[PDB]
Amino acid sequence: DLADRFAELERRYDARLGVYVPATGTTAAIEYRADERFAFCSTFKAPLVAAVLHQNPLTHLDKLITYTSDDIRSISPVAQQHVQTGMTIGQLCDAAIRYSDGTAANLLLADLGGPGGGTAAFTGYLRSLGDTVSRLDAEEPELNRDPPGDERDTTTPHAIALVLQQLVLGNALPPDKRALLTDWMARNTTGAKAIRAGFPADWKVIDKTGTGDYGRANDIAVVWSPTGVPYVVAVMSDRAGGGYDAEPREALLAEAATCVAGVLA
Numbered sequence: 001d002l003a004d005r006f007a008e009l010e011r012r013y014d015a016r017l018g019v020y021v022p023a024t025g026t027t028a029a030i031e032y033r034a035d036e037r038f039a040f041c042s043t044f045k046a047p048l049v050a051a052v053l054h055q056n057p058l059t060h061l062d063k064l065i066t067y068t069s070d071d072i073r074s075i076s077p078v079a080q081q082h083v084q085t086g087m088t089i090g091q092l093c094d095a096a097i098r099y100s101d102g103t104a105a106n107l108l109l110a111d112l113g114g115p116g117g118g119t120a121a122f123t124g125y126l127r128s129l130g131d132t133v134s135r136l137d138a139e140e141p142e143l144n145r146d147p148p149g150d151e152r153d154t155t156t157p158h159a160i161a162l163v164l165q166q167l168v169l170g171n172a173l174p175p176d177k178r179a180l181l182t183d184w185m186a187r188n189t190t191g192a193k194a195i196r197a198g199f200p201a202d203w204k205v206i207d208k209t210g211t212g213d214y215g216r217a218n219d220i221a222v223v224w225s226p227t228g229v230p231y232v233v234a235v236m237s238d239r240a241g242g243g244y245d246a247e248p249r250e251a252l253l254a255e256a257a258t259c260v261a262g263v264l265a
Contacts (some may be wrong), residue, residue: 017252054173212248
């Protein structure tokens, strides 16, 4: 069965694998280690943008944010190009999701404001969606670095799937902000080898990936069948057995997603 497929993938990749797909009209929830904690890595950037959208009028997206050299401390493919000019909140949201830009995320966290450079408020945003499990404690790059087992900067496949479900499919956001978030994840540039790879081309996939140390590789997605039936798919992984420098293996996510897709088809 499916649990056997997932266990096989764990042995193949020397990995710990977590999978959650919420129940629908006709499908039971898919769950595998779904309540085990895994580091968010960059997956937090999608609900982070939702937080910022929720907190402000739509035109806050047009506010220019300035920053400098010492703000670039993590992988930030877009923010490094615009340090001289600044970036609007909208551009930061775009970059945080579509290029997994870490400086954009740190700046959005600061925009949210409050203790921990915005991490407490981010966590508070998840609480407001009924997620009593996830916690964000650090920003980029530190959040990728907690030792395996440490609960700091973690969510679960179950928790994050329910969060994303509310953000994209549910009414956590008004339709106009919901569409912005959805469109950004739809135009994501980093996810081609993750959940996207496991679903047939005629399925729509929007997603946000994350990788980190200890072979961490995650992807959270919403997918739509060719007849418009949506499913939320959370797949999380680490390879603690390889130590800090263990390589993230997105192939594992692709294979797990392929196994999920075979069940949902």
